[PDB]
Design a protein around this ligand. Structure first.
Ligand SMILES: CCCCCCCCCCCCCCCCCC(=O)OC[C@H](COP(=O)([O-])OCC(O)COP(=O)([O-])OC[C@@H](COC(=O)CCCCCCCCCCCCCCCCC)OC(=O)CCCCCCCCCCCCCCCCC)OC(=O)CCCCCCCCCCCCCCCCC
Ligand SMILES: CCCCCCCCCCCCCCCCCC(=O)O[C@@H](COC(=O)CCCCCCCCCCCCCCC)COP(=O)(O)OCC[N+](C)(C)C
Ligand SMILES: CCCCCCCCCCCCCCCCCC(=O)O[C@@H](COC(=O)CCCCCCCCCCCCCCC)COP(=O)(O)OC[C@H](O)CO
Ligand SMILES: CCCCCCCCCCCCCCCCCCCC(=O)O[C@H](COC(=O)CCCCCCCCCCCCCC)COP(=O)(O)OCCN
Ligand SMILES: CCCCCCCCCCCCCCCCCCCC(=O)O[C@H](COC(=O)CCCCCCCCCCCCCC)COP(=O)(O)OCCN
Ligand SMILES: CCCCCCCCCCCCCCCCCC(=O)OC[C@H](COP(=O)(O)O)OC(=O)CCCCCCCCCCCCCCCCC
Ligand SMILES: CCCCCCCCCCCCCCCCCC(=O)OC[C@H](COP(=O)(O)O)OC(=O)CCCCCCCCCCCCCCCCC
Ligand SMILES: CCCCCCCCCCCC(=O)SCCNC(=O)CCNC(=O)[C@H](O)C(C)(C)COP(=O)(O)O
Lengths: 76, 109, 48, 28, 251, 168, 83, 74, 70, 247, 80, 51
């Protein structure tokens, strides 16, 4: 309104129209992709697939934990 | 005077009772063509007594009419969305005036 | 709308006879014609 | 038009932690 | 299966209603609507498709799960199975009634709206219509398309995620040992509910006098409009009780 | 890829919530919709892999609450039921984000709204993917919280505040 | 946008003109209903309800009972921001 | 929103916390009747004894009713 | 106009101060006797008897005598 | 208030853990129903009293009575879940109640009133304070992900294995604490401003934000990975639980 | 109607315990086809029809069996 | 739009009308096709393995 233009918030307050919002949006998208790379690596490392799939699947490209839990007697 | 004011206050009660009864007739009818007849019939109730002159009897009729409204009132009346009680009421209100925001509060000096 | 009150309210509602606000029950089953015609064409095709 | 015409806030509304900025060229 | 099916039609119905409300300047009362089928063709069609899929119209998405549940309840030869069969069967009629009542009051009756609302209407912008189209397609085809995978006789699709003990398996007997009539009661009740909705909301000019002249009919109208007085009773006897304890006893 | 499914809406909500002042309505609408839509695409791939491929996925990140026999963990379970719920949640959420882009276009506070939508999506994903009762409870409470936050989104309305408190 | 006084005047006078007892020749934006037009005050209540529907407003009952003239209704409707 | 009312009279003790046409105990009675409908339907289902008219014998699985496959002693 | 301090309302402050000084109002009335008898003696005793019985029911479920308490 | 709630309150539970339970195990056993009853009564009655309080500081102070009596239930359960949860909840309360007193103090330093009725609508003038206040409000409701949930649930686990009734009465706190915490937050932060009472506002300065940061970090850290704390405590807790018995 | 599928075959094919009935020797090919065809309903139609006919016959035999028992309940009643 | 005594009603967008007509036509055709394919089975006249 009138006083809200003097109020700082993280989400930007009412009717937020930053002038450089396109470049900022692009920078945010690059940041989310960079953050997603290590998450994807950790997920691929951590995934456990006890059963071979019926047909080839995309996770077989990066995940090497297919058919490893067969000897569950030795689990600890 | 006093008899004029006392009769005037009664008139206000009757005019407001009729307004509320008419608005509720629309809540129970929904379709326009049913409202026409229902409104005509309500107006005939008031018109039958329109010509009474005795003031105590007017008060008794007013009290009876209010009691009748309050019993046969529609449980879920229609409200314009931005009116009080409406679905849009107090959504995104304009900010109040007279609000000041202070800067540089609580400095060590 | 026989009484003066109902007559007044019916008079105010004249705009509700708007051509494309009324007789909407004829618009209730859209595509009922195209769908049935397409089904008939398919059925004839299935005969051969 | 909300996607092709840039916004109007040259600077954001408010000041972070309600401190006025230092004079131009100066440091807090 | 029914959860996945409901997520398509109910999301289509809420988003279609949101489109109507947006187009009508945030009017949400069906008593101030009507004659809107021609003004919002796409939204009306989306609401029709969602409603037909919800009531279990044959071969639409909601048809493949709802009637299978009703047939399975019929096949459960227990006290609670009988209870569920009866209640679900009558609820089918009730849901058909209210679905068609919504359609009729919103789009088909002579308009009961305000002129200022009609003169400012507009149909869905593209970021709104796209999800409506996708959900309409889902509500048409997802049921048929996923039926064998999820509930097809002997399917292994679930693997070990779900467990049914042998003693409780009734799907074969529901598809094979049920009288043919049992399978049609959902269509018959739905048809009856649609017909009753048409009569109540179009050819009834005085079935509302009762609620204004009879005390018993008025209280029943209130009973059902006010959710069986459940909130009233709970607040009056439970919430108020705890709130009063907090001040009058403990403090 | 399975972690990306769960955590992409969290990333989108975090950028809309912590940096919405730099993106505004348009940026926050895009950022949040993209992240949920990408999670939806990966969810479809997971449905192909797990349900159609008959290859369940198990992922254990770390212990959460370990006290003697009590063994609550940050662990994820992807079986047929899980991927079915994944498709439902991510697809409907992507569609609802897209719809909201235009439905809330005139609302003053759309970035906060989109952030709340994405945080709800993340908590629902945590709910359906948990491999133990405690992670499921975390998702249960998280969706309760997000529902409360969204019900009273118009915080000036007394009816909304009452409804949100009642729901909680 | 707001509605111009003129538009309010025209649509209020059209509402009043539709009343059956009222003769559509003596309805100015300053006529009084129980003095110039020969109407009972229940007719006034009906006309106020009709103005309410015509502009989509919800007038509080205290204020509705005060509107007794065309001018009174005209000023209420043009001063209302939601008309 | 518009103008919050500033009190001009002494507040009551229970003012921090302060369903219109039906009474309290009357609403309780109507709701009790509604739930008694469910009770009566349950008793009717008991009286029906649908379990005694099942039109098929119980299923019988092979291999001793799947004793080993259900975790029994091999 | 001037200041961040709240503009006091006399009735609100009267309400608050009345809340802070409730102990001066206690009268040993019939209602108060009943409320202290029910909620200050009886209910705690009932809860204690519940907790103890729970342990005794565990004791007899394990083929053990009743554990003595207090 | 921060020192009183965060440290001084912990001295009684520390005394129970440190001298009473291991020195007199037979008496500890004999009095266990008594302690359970007292604590359960405290949790229900004090939570309900909290619900009807009209002063910010009075609401936060009453909340601490319910939390500490849950701690006592945990420690007198005399198992790993119980004592571990009691210690974890002691530490978590020391962080959370201190942060809540700090929030109320931020409000009081500016406006000089503790009466809830004067406030309202503060989200529109103090969004940073509103967000931080909401976070610590969630922590005070034992929301999973926060530090207090770990101790609360571990104590309920410990109690359930000994006496299911006491666990059932203690789990009622989940409902009552939510009620008063959310009611407080919504009456302070949500709604509209009341300019006839307050019209001048200031959000948090740098010092206040910095003060809040370590509380947030600690709450989240204990909430998501309580293993760092529980690993250093298990041997001591185990020997406390076993003291007095030799089987 | 005698059991054809062995226990080993049913375990190797991973049949849900409630579908380990007399008709499982036909369920095995049907489920193989269903998995190979992405569970499309216009696919595997012969396998599915054969399996469903088997299941229908099982139900019919249990219906005739119950028809025989229920006509001896009456024998007891009219002889009492 | 068309204006009738004050009230003006705007004609809908052409693609909106077309999309609604076509999706409903598709729904009606799908119902008819499904009824023909598997309606005797639900009616109970025949069985899927009959032939
Ligand atoms: C045979 C009858 C049995 C009783 C004999 C006494 C006579 C009598 O009471 O009058 C007859 C009386 C009525 O007959 P009447 O026709 O009116 O004839 C009256 C006579 O002419 C007599 O009339 P009178 O006016 O000449 O005499 C009245 C008589 C009446 O006799 C009485 O005194 C009875 C009245 C006492 C009842 C008190 C009720 C409590 C109410 C207070 C409420 C406080 C709550 C506040 C909470 C907060 C509020 C918001 O009083 C006396 O003169 C007797 C003196 C006894 C004094 C007792 C206490 C002295 C202590 C010092 C004073 C107090 C200081 C506090 C310390 C307390 C002590 C530890 O009969 C009865 O009421 C029948 C009694 C039934 C009892 C049940 C059955 C008993 C038998 C059980 C056998 C099992 C084995
Ligand atoms: C058989 C099932 C038995 C078990 C269930 C019994 C419960 C049935 C409830 C019946 C009473 C419901 C509330 C009473 C209201 C009522 O029945 O009349 C309804 C209609 O309800 C029904 O028709 C029953 C639902 C369908 C069941 C057949 C009319 O509603 P109005 O709001 O007045 O609409 C009238 C339209 N107009 C004002 C424009 C004239
Ligand atoms: C871990 C990652 C979690 C990422 C979630 C993003 C959190 C969003 C930041 C808080 C939003 C905020 O800044 O407050 C807004 C408003 O403040 C609030 O509404 C207070 C409530 C904040 C709610 C934040 C909680 C998010 C829920 C996540 C819970 C975290 C999980 C708990 C377990 C660890 C600002 O106001 P506005 O821009 O909307 O404009 C309105 C202004 O007030 C007047 O016009
Ligand atoms: C199984 C028992 C366990 C122990 C419990 C305590 C002992 C048992 C109870 C003792 C009862 C004594 C007799 C009371 C009844 C007589 C009443 C006579 C009339 C009366 O009202 O007298 C009042 C005397 O109150 C009094 O003298 C007050 C009575 C004492 C109350 C005891 C409360 C115990 C603690 C409550 C629970 C606390 C913990 C809860 C978690 C004063 O009248 P007045 O005229 O002055 O009145 C103000 C008017 N202006
Ligand atoms: C202030 C806090 C006081 C708390 C009161 C403790 C409540 C329970 C009391 C237990 C009573 C009790 O066991 O009786 C005797 C204790 O000496 C006693 O009688 C207790 C002495 C303490 C003074 C009185 C406490 C309340 C007065 C204020 C020992 O008797 P026992 O050997 O039969 O015990 C049974 C062993 N199985
Ligand atoms: C379906 C795909 C989205 C299409 C949206 C286009 C909207 C349109 O036509 O614009 C006109 C549209 C309004 O024009 P009107 O509907 O013609 O009135 O403009 C907008 O407000 C939408 C344009 C930007 C918002 C939608 C795109 C941003 C979200 C992108 C998310 C991408 C997720 C997928 C990526 C991989 C995962
Ligand atoms: C257990 C005891 C329950 C009653 C307790 C209340 C006692 C009381 O004061 O009540 C008197 C109660 C009112 O008491 P008052 O407030 O003192 O007047 O009497 C009445 O006037 C209400 C009772 C008659 C009307 C309700 C009849 C039941 C209708 C149920 C219909 C349900 C249909 C659902 C759909 C089916 C399909
Ligand atoms: C669903 C709700 C139920 C329906 C409610 C039913 C209500 C009952 C209907 C009848 C109520 C009465 O008789 S109500 C009282 C009867 N009328 C009188 O007061 C005596 C007449 N005198 C006057 O003051 C005027 O003629 C007056 C007519 C007021 C015009 O006022 P104006 O001088 O300003 O034009």
């Amino acid at each position: 309104g009138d006083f809200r233009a003097k109020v700082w918030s993280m989400t930007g307050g009412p009717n937020c129209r930053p002038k450089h919002w396109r470049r900022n949006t692009a920078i945010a998208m690059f940041g989310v992709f960079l953050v997603c790379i290590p998450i994807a690596k950790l997920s691929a490392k951590l995934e456990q697939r006890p059963h071979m799939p019926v047909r080839p699947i995309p996770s077989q490209i990066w995940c090497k934990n297919f058919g490893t839990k067969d000897d569950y007697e030795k689990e600890h | 005077a006093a008899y004029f004011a006392r009769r005037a206050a009664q008139k206000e009660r009757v005019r407001i009772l009729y307004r509320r009864a008419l608005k509720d007739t629309l809540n129970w009818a929904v379709h326009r063509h049913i409202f026409y007849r229902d409104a005509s019939d309500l107006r005939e109730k008031f018109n039958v007594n329109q010509d009474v002159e005795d003031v105590d009897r007017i008060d008794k009729l007013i009290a009876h009419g209010e009691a009748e409204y309050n019993k046969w009132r529609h449980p879920d009346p229609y409200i314009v969305p931005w009116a009080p009680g409406g679905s849009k009421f107090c959504r995104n209100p304009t900010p109040p005036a007279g609000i000041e925001i202070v800067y540089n509060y609580g400095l060590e000096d | 709308p026989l009484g003066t009150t109902g007559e007044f309210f019916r008079r105010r509602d004249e705009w509700r006879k708007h051509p494309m606000l009324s007789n909407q029950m004829r618009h209730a089953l859209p595509g009922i014609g195209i769908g049935v015609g397409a089904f008939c064409v398919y059925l004839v095709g299935e005969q051969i | 038009s909300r996607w092709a015409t840039p916004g109007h806030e040259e600077r954001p509304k408010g000041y972070f932690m309600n401190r006025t900025p230092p004079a131009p060229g100066q440091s807090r | 299966f029914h959860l996945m099916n409901h997520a398509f039609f109910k999301a289509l119905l809420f988003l279609s209603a949101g489109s109507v409300i947006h187009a009508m300047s945030d009017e949400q009362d069906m008593r101030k609507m009507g004659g809107l089928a021609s003004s919002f063709p796409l939204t009306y069609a989306m609401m029709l498709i969602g409603s037909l899929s919800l009531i279990g119209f044959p071969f639409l998405t909601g048809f493949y799960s709802k009637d299978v549940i009703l047939e399975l309840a019929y096949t459960k030869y227990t006290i609670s199975g009988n209870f569920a069969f009866w209640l679900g069967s009558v609820s089918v009629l009730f849901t058909s009634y209210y679905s068609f009542r919504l359609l009729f009051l919103t789009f088909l009756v002579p308009t009961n709206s305000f002129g200022r609302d009609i003169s400012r209407c507009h149909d869905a912008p593209i970021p709104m219509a796209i999800p409506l189209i996708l959900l309409a397609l889902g509500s048409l085809f997802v049921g048929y398309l996923a039926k064998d995978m999820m509930i097809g006789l002997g399917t292994n699709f679930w693997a070990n995620s779900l467990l049914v003990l042998p003693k409780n398996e009734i799907l074969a007997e529901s598809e094979f040992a049920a009288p043919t009539i049992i399978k049609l009661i959902p269509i018959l009740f739905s048809t009856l509910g649609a017909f009753v909705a048409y009569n109540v909301n179009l050819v009834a000019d005085q079935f509302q006098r009762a609620f204004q002249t009879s005390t018993f009919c008025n209280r029943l109208y209130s009973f059902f409009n006010k959710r069986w007085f459940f909130d009233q009773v709970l607040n009056d006897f439970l919430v108020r009780s705890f709130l009063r304890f907090g001040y009058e006893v403990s403090f | 890829m399975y972690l990306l499914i769960v955590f992409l809406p969290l990333l989108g909500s975090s950028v809309a919530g912590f940096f919405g002042r730099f993106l505004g309505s348009e940026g926050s609408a895009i950022m949040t919709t993209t992240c949920v839509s990408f999670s939806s695409i990966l969810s479809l791939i997971a449905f192909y892999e797990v349900a159609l491929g008959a290859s369940a996925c198990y992922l254990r990140i770390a212990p959460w609450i370990s006290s003697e026999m009590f063994d609550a963990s940050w662990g994820f379970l992807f079986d047929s039921l899980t991927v079915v719920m994944l498709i439902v949640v991510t697809f409907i959420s992507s569609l609802v984000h897209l719809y909201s882009i235009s439905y809330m276009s005139e609302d003053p506070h759309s970035p906060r709204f989109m952030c709340y939508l994405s945080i709800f999506t993340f908590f629902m994903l945590m709910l359906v993917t948990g491999d133990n009762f405690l992670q499921l409870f975390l998702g249960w409470e998280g969706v309760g919280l997000a529902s409360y936050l969204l019900i009273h989104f118009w915080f000036t309305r007394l009816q909304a505040d009452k409804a949100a408190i009642k729901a909680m | 946008d707001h509605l111009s006084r003129e538009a309010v005047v025209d649509r209020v006078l059209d509402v009043v003109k539709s009343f059956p007892k009222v003769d559509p020749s003596k309805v100015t934006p300053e006529v009084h209903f129980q003095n110039d037009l020969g109407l009972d005050s229940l007719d006034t209540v009906e006309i106020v309800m009709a103005i309410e529907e015509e502009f989509k407003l919800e007038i509080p009952d205290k204020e509705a009972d005060k509107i007794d003239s065309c001018s009174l209704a005209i000023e209420y409707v043009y001063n209302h921001p939601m008309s | 929103v518009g103008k919050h009312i500033v009190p001009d009279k002494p507040l009551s003790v229970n003012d921090e916390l302060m369903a219109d046409t039906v009474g309290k105990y009357e609403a309780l009675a109507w709701l009790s009747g509604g739930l008694g409908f469910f009770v009566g339907l349950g008793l009717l289902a008991v009286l029906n004894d649908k379990a005694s008219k099942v039109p098929f014998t119980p299923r019988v699985y092979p291999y001793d009713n799947l004793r080993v496959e259900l975790g029994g002693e091999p | 106009g001037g200041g961040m301090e709240t503009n006091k309302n006399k009735f609100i402050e009267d309400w608050g101060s009345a809340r802070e000084n409730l102990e001066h109002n206690f009268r040993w009335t019939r209602r108060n006797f009943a409320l202290i008898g029910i909620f200050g003696i009886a209910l705690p005793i009932i809860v204690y008897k519940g907790i103890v019985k729970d342990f005794h029911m565990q004791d007899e479920d394990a083929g053990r005598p009743h554990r003595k308490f207090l | 208030s921060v020192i009183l709630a965060g440290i001084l309150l912990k001295f009684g539970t520390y005394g129970f853990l440190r001298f009473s339970i291991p020195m007199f195990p037979e008496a500890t056993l004999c009095f266990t129903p008594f302690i359970y009853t007292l604590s359960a009564i405290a949790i229900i009655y004090t939570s309900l009293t909290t619900l009807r309080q009209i002063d910010l500081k009075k609401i936060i102070a009453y909340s601490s009575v319910a939390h500490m009596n849950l701690v006592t239930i945990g420690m007198f359960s005399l198992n790993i879940q119980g004592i571990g949860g009691s210690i974890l909840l002691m530490l978590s309360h020391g962080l959370v109640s201190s942060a809540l007193f700090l929030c109320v103090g931020v409000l009081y330093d500016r406006h000089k009133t503790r009466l809830v009725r004067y406030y309202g609508g503060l989200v529109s003038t103090m969004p940073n304070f509103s967000t931080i206040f909401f976070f610590f409000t969630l922590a005070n409701m034992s929301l999973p992900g926060t530090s207090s949930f770990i101790g609360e649930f571990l104590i309920l686990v410990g109690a359930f294995q000994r006496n299911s009734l006491v666990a059932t009465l203690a789990a009622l706190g989940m409902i009552l604490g939510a009620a008063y915490s959310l009611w407080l937050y919504n009456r302070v932060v949500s709604g509209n401003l009341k300019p006839d009472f307050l019209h001048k506002f200031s959000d948090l300065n740098g010092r206040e934000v910095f003060i809040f940061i370590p509380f947030l970090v600690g709450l989240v850290w204990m909430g998501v990975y309580p293993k760092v704390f529980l690993d250093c405590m298990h041997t001591s807790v185990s020997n406390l639980v076993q003291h007095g018995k030799f089987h | 109607k005698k059991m054809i599928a062995t226990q080993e075959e049913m375990s190797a094919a991973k049949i849900a315990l409630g579908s380990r009935d007399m008709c499982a020797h036909l369920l095995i090919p049907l489920n193989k086809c269903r998995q190979a065809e992405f569970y499309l309903p216009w696919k595997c139609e012969d396998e599915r029809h054969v399996y469903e006919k088997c299941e229908y016959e099982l139900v019919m035999e249990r219906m005739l069996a119950m028809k025989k028992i229920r006509e001896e309940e009456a024998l007891a009643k009219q002889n009492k | 739009g068309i204006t009738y005594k004050g009230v003006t009603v705007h004609t809908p967008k052409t693609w909106h009308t077309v999309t609604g007509k076509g999706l409903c036509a598709v729904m009606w055709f799908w119902i008819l096709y499904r009824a023909k394919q598997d309606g005797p089975v639900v009616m109970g006249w025949r069985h899927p393995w009959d032939g």
